[PDB]
């Protein structure tokens, strides 16, 4: 199997297919252990945001790839923003303040 960019689930903007392409590979805890062990901060950074479930990040970084710019320009993944809304959905309030 191989996947560059395909479909994503409605609930969580995570890669999946079987209709035209193939659902992307799963990283996991066992792998993030290794990346932390190496110290590959940027590898894990992308693997957790733009390379996975970052709505605008994937598109922005994709355009950066086709233009031969690479870089990243990451952002807060929806797999945490949803968590913010879910916790906020209860009587408990969580806010991300500046400094």
């Amino acid at each position: 199997h191989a996947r560059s960019t395909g479909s994503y689930s409605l609930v969580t903007q995570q890669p999946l297919g079987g209709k035209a392409q193939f659902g992307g590979q799963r990283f996991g805890e066992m792998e993030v252990w290794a990346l932390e062990a190496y110290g590959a901060a940027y590898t894990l950074q992308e693997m957790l945001t733009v390379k996975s479930d970052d709505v605008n990040g994937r598109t922005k970084m994709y355009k950066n790839i086709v233009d031969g710019n690479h870089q990243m320009e990451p952002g807060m993944p929806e797999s945490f923003n949803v968590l913010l809304k879910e916790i906020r959905s209860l009587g408990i309030n969580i806010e991300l303040e500046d400094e």
């Binding site: 110290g39 940027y42 031969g68 710019n69 690479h70 870089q71």
Partner: protein, 90 residues
């Protein structure tokens, strides 16, 4: 540094900073003002930066200083516009 890359770390301790500065230089090359120092020989910008670091040129202080000169070149040489704008709102 096609296979270590280990000979570059002793030039700047802690492999991490090595990755930072090398990615910095490679970022300068891939997009914007290219101009490599060590001959390309059909190598990606990933390794070219590592070659330079191994060569002895292009470090952290080097890039920072050249960035300072770059700023003093873009700013001081083109102040005739900024100064003219300074009189815009008195």
């Amino acid at each position: 540094a096609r296979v270590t890359v280990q000979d570059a770390v002793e030039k700047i301790g802690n492999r991490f900073d090595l990755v930072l500065v090398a990615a910095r230089r490679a970022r300068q090359m891939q997009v914007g003002g290219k101009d490599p120092l060590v001959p390309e020989e059909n190598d990606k910008t990933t390794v070219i930066a590592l070659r330079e670091i191994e060569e002895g040129l292009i470090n952290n202080q080097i890039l920072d200083v050249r960035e300072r000169q770059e700023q003093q070149e873009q700013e001081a040489a083109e102040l005739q516009a900024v100064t003219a704008i300074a009189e815009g709102r008195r």
